[PDB]
PDB file of C-alpha atoms and ligand atoms in Angstrom:
ATOM      1  CA  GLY A   1      44.754  42.915 138.827  1.00  0.00           C
ATOM      2  CA  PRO A   2      46.542  45.565 136.686  1.00  0.00           C
ATOM      3  CA  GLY A   3      47.942  47.369 139.757  1.00  0.00           C
ATOM      4  CA  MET A   4      51.585  48.486 140.131  1.00  0.00           C
ATOM      5  CA  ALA A   5      52.333  48.084 143.841  1.00  0.00           C
ATOM      6  CA  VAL A   6      55.802  47.920 145.248  1.00  0.00           C
ATOM      7  CA  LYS A   7      57.391  45.334 147.579  1.00  0.00           C
ATOM      8  CA  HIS A   8      59.715  46.242 150.472  1.00  0.00           C
ATOM      9  CA  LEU A   9      62.063  43.331 151.145  1.00  0.00           C
ATOM     10  CA  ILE A  10      64.223  43.205 154.329  1.00  0.00           C
ATOM     11  CA  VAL A  11      67.018  40.633 154.773  1.00  0.00           C
ATOM     12  CA  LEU A  12      68.444  40.426 158.349  1.00  0.00           C
ATOM     13  CA  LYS A  13      71.312  38.831 160.190  1.00  0.00           C
ATOM     14  CA  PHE A  14      71.101  39.275 163.999  1.00  0.00           C
ATOM     15  CA  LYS A  15      74.106  39.680 166.188  1.00  0.00           C
ATOM     16  CA  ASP A  16      75.353  36.367 167.552  1.00  0.00           C
ATOM     17  CA  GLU A  17      74.420  37.213 171.098  1.00  0.00           C
ATOM     18  CA  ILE A  18      70.706  37.654 170.267  1.00  0.00           C
ATOM     19  CA  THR A  19      68.686  34.688 171.467  1.00  0.00           C
ATOM     20  CA  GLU A  20      65.962  32.931 169.550  1.00  0.00           C
ATOM     21  CA  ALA A  21      63.338  34.223 172.023  1.00  0.00           C
ATOM     22  CA  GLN A  22      64.665  37.772 171.472  1.00  0.00           C
ATOM     23  CA  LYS A  23      64.451  37.427 167.683  1.00  0.00           C
ATOM     24  CA  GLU A  24      60.871  36.238 168.176  1.00  0.00           C
ATOM     25  CA  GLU A  25      59.980  39.304 170.226  1.00  0.00           C
ATOM     26  CA  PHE A  26      61.692  41.549 167.641  1.00  0.00           C
ATOM     27  CA  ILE A  27      59.601  40.075 164.862  1.00  0.00           C
ATOM     28  CA  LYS A  28      56.419  40.253 166.863  1.00  0.00           C
ATOM     29  CA  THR A  29      56.871  43.924 167.701  1.00  0.00           C
ATOM     30  CA  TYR A  30      57.724  44.680 164.076  1.00  0.00           C
ATOM     31  CA  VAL A  31      54.597  43.029 162.756  1.00  0.00           C
ATOM     32  CA  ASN A  32      52.608  45.128 165.189  1.00  0.00           C
ATOM     33  CA  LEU A  33      53.606  48.229 163.218  1.00  0.00           C
ATOM     34  CA  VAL A  34      50.936  47.223 160.700  1.00  0.00           C
ATOM     35  CA  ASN A  35      48.324  48.383 163.220  1.00  0.00           C
ATOM     36  CA  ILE A  36      50.059  51.806 163.623  1.00  0.00           C
ATOM     37  CA  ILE A  37      51.609  52.869 160.274  1.00  0.00           C
ATOM     38  CA  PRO A  38      48.961  53.604 157.569  1.00  0.00           C
ATOM     39  CA  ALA A  39      51.307  52.836 154.647  1.00  0.00           C
ATOM     40  CA  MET A  40      51.967  49.265 155.826  1.00  0.00           C
ATOM     41  CA  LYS A  41      49.651  47.012 153.855  1.00  0.00           C
ATOM     42  CA  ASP A  42      50.693  43.471 154.795  1.00  0.00           C
ATOM     43  CA  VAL A  43      53.665  41.614 156.270  1.00  0.00           C
ATOM     44  CA  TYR A  44      55.122  38.151 155.792  1.00  0.00           C
ATOM     45  CA  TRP A  45      58.296  36.880 157.295  1.00  0.00           C
ATOM     46  CA  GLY A  46      60.357  33.726 157.223  1.00  0.00           C
ATOM     47  CA  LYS A  47      63.506  32.047 158.534  1.00  0.00           C
ATOM     48  CA  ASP A  48      65.965  30.634 156.064  1.00  0.00           C
ATOM     49  CA  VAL A  49      66.385  26.897 156.198  1.00  0.00           C
ATOM     50  CA  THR A  50      69.171  26.122 153.722  1.00  0.00           C
ATOM     51  CA  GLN A  51      72.068  28.254 155.112  1.00  0.00           C
ATOM     52  CA  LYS A  52      73.861  28.557 151.838  1.00  0.00           C
ATOM     53  CA  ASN A  53      75.497  32.033 152.158  1.00  0.00           C
ATOM     54  CA  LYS A  54      78.654  31.175 154.124  1.00  0.00           C
ATOM     55  CA  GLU A  55      80.136  34.375 155.622  1.00  0.00           C
ATOM     56  CA  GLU A  56      76.933  36.376 154.792  1.00  0.00           C
ATOM     57  CA  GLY A  57      74.664  34.388 157.062  1.00  0.00           C
ATOM     58  CA  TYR A  58      71.444  36.290 156.939  1.00  0.00           C
ATOM     59  CA  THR A  59      68.654  34.330 158.644  1.00  0.00           C
ATOM     60  CA  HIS A  60      65.417  36.331 158.400  1.00  0.00           C
ATOM     61  CA  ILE A  61      63.399  37.646 155.506  1.00  0.00           C
ATOM     62  CA  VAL A  62      60.587  40.154 155.820  1.00  0.00           C
ATOM     63  CA  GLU A  63      58.323  41.276 152.970  1.00  0.00           C
ATOM     64  CA  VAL A  64      55.853  44.163 153.081  1.00  0.00           C
ATOM     65  CA  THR A  65      53.612  45.422 150.351  1.00  0.00           C
ATOM     66  CA  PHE A  66      53.179  49.171 149.750  1.00  0.00           C
ATOM     67  CA  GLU A  67      51.326  51.316 147.201  1.00  0.00           C
ATOM     68  CA  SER A  68      54.525  53.043 146.038  1.00  0.00           C
ATOM     69  CA  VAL A  69      58.073  53.987 146.854  1.00  0.00           C
ATOM     70  CA  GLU A  70      56.786  57.271 148.289  1.00  0.00           C
ATOM     71  CA  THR A  71      54.666  55.358 150.834  1.00  0.00           C
ATOM     72  CA  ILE A  72      57.629  53.142 151.734  1.00  0.00           C
ATOM     73  CA  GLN A  73      59.329  56.414 152.549  1.00  0.00           C
ATOM     74  CA  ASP A  74      56.322  57.460 154.653  1.00  0.00           C
ATOM     75  CA  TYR A  75      56.814  54.226 156.609  1.00  0.00           C
ATOM     76  CA  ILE A  76      60.593  54.889 157.076  1.00  0.00           C
ATOM     77  CA  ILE A  77      60.017  58.268 158.712  1.00  0.00           C
ATOM     78  CA  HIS A  78      56.822  57.391 160.658  1.00  0.00           C
ATOM     79  CA  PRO A  79      57.663  57.818 164.389  1.00  0.00           C
ATOM     80  CA  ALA A  80      56.659  54.292 165.254  1.00  0.00           C
ATOM     81  CA  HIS A  81      59.149  53.072 162.672  1.00  0.00           C
ATOM     82  CA  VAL A  82      61.880  55.449 163.708  1.00  0.00           C
ATOM     83  CA  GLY A  83      61.359  54.458 167.363  1.00  0.00           C
ATOM     84  CA  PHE A  84      61.485  50.714 166.536  1.00  0.00           C
ATOM     85  CA  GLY A  85      64.594  51.181 164.472  1.00  0.00           C
ATOM     86  CA  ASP A  86      66.401  53.297 167.065  1.00  0.00           C
ATOM     87  CA  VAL A  87      65.849  50.927 169.962  1.00  0.00           C
ATOM     88  CA  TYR A  88      66.480  47.664 168.042  1.00  0.00           C
ATOM     89  CA  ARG A  89      69.347  48.843 165.869  1.00  0.00           C
ATOM     90  CA  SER A  90      71.903  47.025 168.047  1.00  0.00           C
ATOM     91  CA  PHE A  91      70.085  43.761 167.347  1.00  0.00           C
ATOM     92  CA  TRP A  92      71.366  43.304 163.854  1.00  0.00           C
ATOM     93  CA  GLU A  93      74.762  42.859 162.322  1.00  0.00           C
ATOM     94  CA  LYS A  94      73.742  42.985 158.633  1.00  0.00           C
ATOM     95  CA  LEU A  95      70.714  44.478 156.984  1.00  0.00           C
ATOM     96  CA  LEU A  96      69.687  44.579 153.300  1.00  0.00           C
ATOM     97  CA  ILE A  97      66.753  46.528 151.941  1.00  0.00           C
ATOM     98  CA  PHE A  98      65.122  46.235 148.475  1.00  0.00           C
ATOM     99  CA  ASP A  99      62.211  48.141 147.007  1.00  0.00           C
ATOM    100  CA  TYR A 100      60.920  46.731 143.717  1.00  0.00           C
ATOM    101  CA  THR A 101      57.884  45.973 141.617  1.00  0.00           C
ATOM    102  CA  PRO A 102      57.736  42.159 140.885  1.00  0.00           C
ATOM    103  CA  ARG A 103      57.433  41.210 137.286  1.00  0.00           C
ATOM    104  CA  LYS A 104      57.501  38.189 134.971  1.00  0.00           C
TER     105      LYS A 104
ATOM    106  CA  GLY B   1      45.539  27.040 152.679  1.00  0.00           C
ATOM    107  CA  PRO B   2      45.514  23.487 151.251  1.00  0.00           C
ATOM    108  CA  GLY B   3      48.666  23.986 149.189  1.00  0.00           C
ATOM    109  CA  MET B   4      52.103  24.077 150.777  1.00  0.00           C
ATOM    110  CA  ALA B   5      54.907  26.178 149.287  1.00  0.00           C
ATOM    111  CA  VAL B   6      58.454  27.260 149.940  1.00  0.00           C
ATOM    112  CA  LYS B   7      59.948  30.460 148.503  1.00  0.00           C
ATOM    113  CA  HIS B   8      63.379  30.295 146.868  1.00  0.00           C
ATOM    114  CA  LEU B   9      64.862  33.827 146.980  1.00  0.00           C
ATOM    115  CA  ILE B  10      67.814  34.943 144.862  1.00  0.00           C
ATOM    116  CA  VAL B  11      69.601  38.310 145.469  1.00  0.00           C
ATOM    117  CA  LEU B  12      72.085  39.299 142.798  1.00  0.00           C
ATOM    118  CA  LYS B  13      74.676  41.859 141.903  1.00  0.00           C
ATOM    119  CA  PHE B  14      75.936  41.776 138.342  1.00  0.00           C
ATOM    120  CA  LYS B  15      79.512  42.544 137.478  1.00  0.00           C
ATOM    121  CA  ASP B  16      80.013  46.157 136.547  1.00  0.00           C
ATOM    122  CA  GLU B  17      80.897  45.501 132.973  1.00  0.00           C
ATOM    123  CA  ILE B  18      77.796  43.438 132.239  1.00  0.00           C
ATOM    124  CA  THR B  19      75.490  45.280 129.768  1.00  0.00           C
ATOM    125  CA  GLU B  20      71.772  45.854 130.180  1.00  0.00           C
ATOM    126  CA  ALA B  21      71.382  43.566 127.071  1.00  0.00           C
ATOM    127  CA  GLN B  22      73.335  40.859 128.847  1.00  0.00           C
ATOM    128  CA  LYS B  23      71.180  41.215 132.000  1.00  0.00           C
ATOM    129  CA  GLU B  24      68.037  40.858 129.828  1.00  0.00           C
ATOM    130  CA  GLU B  25      69.450  37.639 128.262  1.00  0.00           C
ATOM    131  CA  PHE B  26      70.327  36.261 131.647  1.00  0.00           C
ATOM    132  CA  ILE B  27      66.879  36.987 133.083  1.00  0.00           C
ATOM    133  CA  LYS B  28      64.911  35.739 130.060  1.00  0.00           C
ATOM    134  CA  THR B  29      66.864  32.491 130.046  1.00  0.00           C
ATOM    135  CA  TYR B  30      66.319  32.024 133.811  1.00  0.00           C
ATOM    136  CA  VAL B  31      62.606  32.631 133.678  1.00  0.00           C
ATOM    137  CA  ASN B  32      62.391  30.215 130.749  1.00  0.00           C
ATOM    138  CA  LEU B  33      63.590  27.445 133.108  1.00  0.00           C
ATOM    139  CA  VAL B  34      59.950  27.016 134.176  1.00  0.00           C
ATOM    140  CA  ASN B  35      59.481  25.340 130.689  1.00  0.00           C
ATOM    141  CA  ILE B  36      62.325  22.938 131.451  1.00  0.00           C
ATOM    142  CA  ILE B  37      62.200  22.299 135.272  1.00  0.00           C
ATOM    143  CA  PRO B  38      58.588  21.499 136.255  1.00  0.00           C
ATOM    144  CA  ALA B  39      59.381  21.956 139.966  1.00  0.00           C
ATOM    145  CA  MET B  40      59.502  25.765 139.353  1.00  0.00           C
ATOM    146  CA  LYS B  41      55.888  26.899 139.824  1.00  0.00           C
ATOM    147  CA  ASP B  42      56.204  30.684 139.595  1.00  0.00           C
ATOM    148  CA  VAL B  43      59.064  33.116 138.911  1.00  0.00           C
ATOM    149  CA  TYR B  44      58.919  36.822 139.680  1.00  0.00           C
ATOM    150  CA  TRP B  45      61.825  39.173 139.576  1.00  0.00           C
ATOM    151  CA  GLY B  46      62.562  42.855 140.107  1.00  0.00           C
ATOM    152  CA  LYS B  47      65.221  45.511 140.314  1.00  0.00           C
ATOM    153  CA  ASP B  48      65.702  47.527 143.440  1.00  0.00           C
ATOM    154  CA  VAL B  49      64.968  51.291 143.006  1.00  0.00           C
ATOM    155  CA  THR B  50      66.107  52.599 146.412  1.00  0.00           C
ATOM    156  CA  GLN B  51      69.882  51.696 146.347  1.00  0.00           C
ATOM    157  CA  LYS B  52      70.359  51.979 150.111  1.00  0.00           C
ATOM    158  CA  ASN B  53      72.700  48.926 150.565  1.00  0.00           C
ATOM    159  CA  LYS B  54      75.867  51.000 150.936  1.00  0.00           C
ATOM    160  CA  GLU B  55      77.930  48.040 152.142  1.00  0.00           C
ATOM    161  CA  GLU B  56      77.071  45.480 149.382  1.00  0.00           C
ATOM    162  CA  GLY B  57      75.364  46.792 146.179  1.00  0.00           C
ATOM    163  CA  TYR B  58      72.911  43.997 145.388  1.00  0.00           C
ATOM    164  CA  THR B  59      70.465  45.162 142.671  1.00  0.00           C
ATOM    165  CA  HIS B  60      68.215  42.244 141.495  1.00  0.00           C
ATOM    166  CA  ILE B  61      65.711  39.995 143.258  1.00  0.00           C
ATOM    167  CA  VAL B  62      64.343  36.758 141.823  1.00  0.00           C
ATOM    168  CA  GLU B  63      61.629  34.815 143.721  1.00  0.00           C
ATOM    169  CA  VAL B  64      60.687  31.253 142.723  1.00  0.00           C
ATOM    170  CA  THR B  65      57.764  29.340 144.303  1.00  0.00           C
ATOM    171  CA  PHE B  66      58.283  25.557 144.923  1.00  0.00           C
ATOM    172  CA  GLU B  67      56.091  22.970 146.581  1.00  0.00           C
ATOM    173  CA  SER B  68      58.788  21.745 149.055  1.00  0.00           C
ATOM    174  CA  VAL B  69      62.455  21.837 149.929  1.00  0.00           C
ATOM    175  CA  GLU B  70      62.616  18.446 148.192  1.00  0.00           C
ATOM    176  CA  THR B  71      61.512  19.858 144.868  1.00  0.00           C
ATOM    177  CA  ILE B  72      63.983  22.737 145.359  1.00  0.00           C
ATOM    178  CA  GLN B  73      66.688  20.068 145.659  1.00  0.00           C
ATOM    179  CA  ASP B  74      65.443  18.544 142.399  1.00  0.00           C
ATOM    180  CA  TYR B  75      65.786  21.981 140.749  1.00  0.00           C
ATOM    181  CA  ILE B  76      69.315  22.561 142.123  1.00  0.00           C
ATOM    182  CA  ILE B  77      70.755  19.351 140.657  1.00  0.00           C
ATOM    183  CA  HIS B  78      68.732  19.429 137.382  1.00  0.00           C
ATOM    184  CA  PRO B  79      71.094  19.477 134.407  1.00  0.00           C
ATOM    185  CA  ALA B  80      69.518  22.643 133.012  1.00  0.00           C
ATOM    186  CA  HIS B  81      70.167  24.479 136.309  1.00  0.00           C
ATOM    187  CA  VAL B  82      73.793  23.306 136.300  1.00  0.00           C
ATOM    188  CA  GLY B  83      73.974  24.384 132.688  1.00  0.00           C
ATOM    189  CA  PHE B  84      72.538  27.789 133.529  1.00  0.00           C
ATOM    190  CA  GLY B  85      75.473  28.230 135.937  1.00  0.00           C
ATOM    191  CA  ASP B  86      77.872  26.864 133.233  1.00  0.00           C
ATOM    192  CA  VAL B  87      76.926  29.708 130.940  1.00  0.00           C
ATOM    193  CA  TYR B  88      76.006  32.567 133.288  1.00  0.00           C
ATOM    194  CA  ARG B  89      78.023  32.216 136.492  1.00  0.00           C
ATOM    195  CA  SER B  90      80.517  34.744 134.981  1.00  0.00           C
ATOM    196  CA  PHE B  91      77.749  37.378 135.044  1.00  0.00           C
ATOM    197  CA  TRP B  92      77.373  37.909 138.761  1.00  0.00           C
ATOM    198  CA  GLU B  93      79.721  39.455 141.313  1.00  0.00           C
ATOM    199  CA  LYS B  94      77.632  38.554 144.363  1.00  0.00           C
ATOM    200  CA  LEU B  95      74.773  36.199 145.060  1.00  0.00           C
ATOM    201  CA  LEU B  96      72.635  35.340 148.059  1.00  0.00           C
ATOM    202  CA  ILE B  97      70.284  32.341 148.201  1.00  0.00           C
ATOM    203  CA  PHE B  98      67.430  31.816 150.721  1.00  0.00           C
ATOM    204  CA  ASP B  99      64.705  29.126 151.103  1.00  0.00           C
ATOM    205  CA  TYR B 100      61.855  29.905 153.513  1.00  0.00           C
ATOM    206  CA  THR B 101      58.150  29.425 154.138  1.00  0.00           C
ATOM    207  CA  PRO B 102      56.499  32.856 154.461  1.00  0.00           C
ATOM    208  CA  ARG B 103      54.187  33.195 157.409  1.00  0.00           C
ATOM    209  CA  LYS B 104      52.225  35.818 159.323  1.00  0.00           C
TER     210      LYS B 104
HETATM  211  C1  4MX C 201      62.446  43.939 160.513  1.00  0.00           C
HETATM  212  C2  4MX C 201      63.608  44.818 160.332  1.00  0.00           C
HETATM  213  C3  4MX C 201      63.236  46.269 160.477  1.00  0.00           C
HETATM  214  C4  4MX C 201      64.369  47.223 160.037  1.00  0.00           C
HETATM  215  C5  4MX C 201      64.030  48.683 160.221  1.00  0.00           C
HETATM  216  C6  4MX C 201      64.896  49.552 159.285  1.00  0.00           C
HETATM  217  C7  4MX C 201      66.060  50.117 159.773  1.00  0.00           C
HETATM  218  C8  4MX C 201      66.869  50.854 158.890  1.00  0.00           C
HETATM  219  O1  4MX C 201      68.053  51.419 159.366  1.00  0.00           O
HETATM  220  C9  4MX C 201      66.492  51.051 157.575  1.00  0.00           C
HETATM  221  C10 4MX C 201      65.312  50.501 157.083  1.00  0.00           C
HETATM  222  O2  4MX C 201      64.964  50.678 155.775  1.00  0.00           O
HETATM  223  C11 4MX C 201      64.482  49.721 157.932  1.00  0.00           C
HETATM  224  C12 4MX C 201      63.178  49.152 157.319  1.00  0.00           C
HETATM  225  O3  4MX C 201      63.117  48.911 156.131  1.00  0.00           O
HETATM  226  O4  4MX C 201      62.221  48.914 158.093  1.00  0.00           O
HETATM  227  C1  4MX C 202      69.093  33.807 138.617  1.00  0.00           C
HETATM  228  C2  4MX C 202      70.191  33.600 139.687  1.00  0.00           C
HETATM  229  C3  4MX C 202      71.053  32.413 139.372  1.00  0.00           C
HETATM  230  C4  4MX C 202      71.486  31.628 140.614  1.00  0.00           C
HETATM  231  C5  4MX C 202      71.843  30.145 140.276  1.00  0.00           C
HETATM  232  C6  4MX C 202      72.411  29.554 141.591  1.00  0.00           C
HETATM  233  C7  4MX C 202      73.774  29.565 141.652  1.00  0.00           C
HETATM  234  C8  4MX C 202      74.436  29.065 142.785  1.00  0.00           C
HETATM  235  O1  4MX C 202      75.830  29.124 142.902  1.00  0.00           O
HETATM  236  C9  4MX C 202      73.697  28.532 143.785  1.00  0.00           C
HETATM  237  C10 4MX C 202      72.287  28.487 143.728  1.00  0.00           C
HETATM  238  O2  4MX C 202      71.572  27.968 144.778  1.00  0.00           O
HETATM  239  C11 4MX C 202      71.662  28.983 142.580  1.00  0.00           C
HETATM  240  C12 4MX C 202      70.131  28.941 142.525  1.00  0.00           C
HETATM  241  O3  4MX C 202      69.461  28.647 143.577  1.00  0.00           O
HETATM  242  O4  4MX C 202      69.548  29.046 141.410  1.00  0.00           O
END
């Protein structure tokens, strides 16, 4: 299609004390936001397998499609997102966010 | 689906003195590798528009689709990939590399 949607990419390193089961619950309760936040179109996630980044050991990648930067911003301030971020902020050591329109 | 795939994700910050013309050369030559390295099935890239990574400053995202981690390895050691580094390594200040299978 000719559409011009925008991807929201999250790259995450959890604190060392967070267990694998806790990471799984974190991801599960994040994906559930799709059922609550209108702007959230779809979610994919993955765990890195090559561990190539040395001291910057991010492990988890989450990708969400949105209709525009403005609706990404709607998602950021939605109370279910604010509430998730508040209570799970101590889970992560490093967080990177990117909003972009993929191109050839 | 019937096809398996792994995503190869590159996150990049250029050095401050690199020009927009240089970034365009870099990116065009990278995306052209699909004509040299058959393992590369798709390449999409984009530039972050939000700029909210206060601690790091990454700007560019490149996503390459591969069939498997084995064909990613073929790409890494391919002479044209080594050669791309030979000519363009001096262009980036920071780099992150990830390999993952996206899932729901
Ligand atoms: C699965 C990780 C969710 C991270 C939640 C979050 C926290 C924050 O401080 C800033 C953000 O832009 C986001 C987000 O993009 O959702
Ligand atoms: C367009 C970004 C160029 C990155 C080239 C590169 C450099 C490096 O030091 C390690 C790598 O795994 C890669 C790569 O995966 O392609």
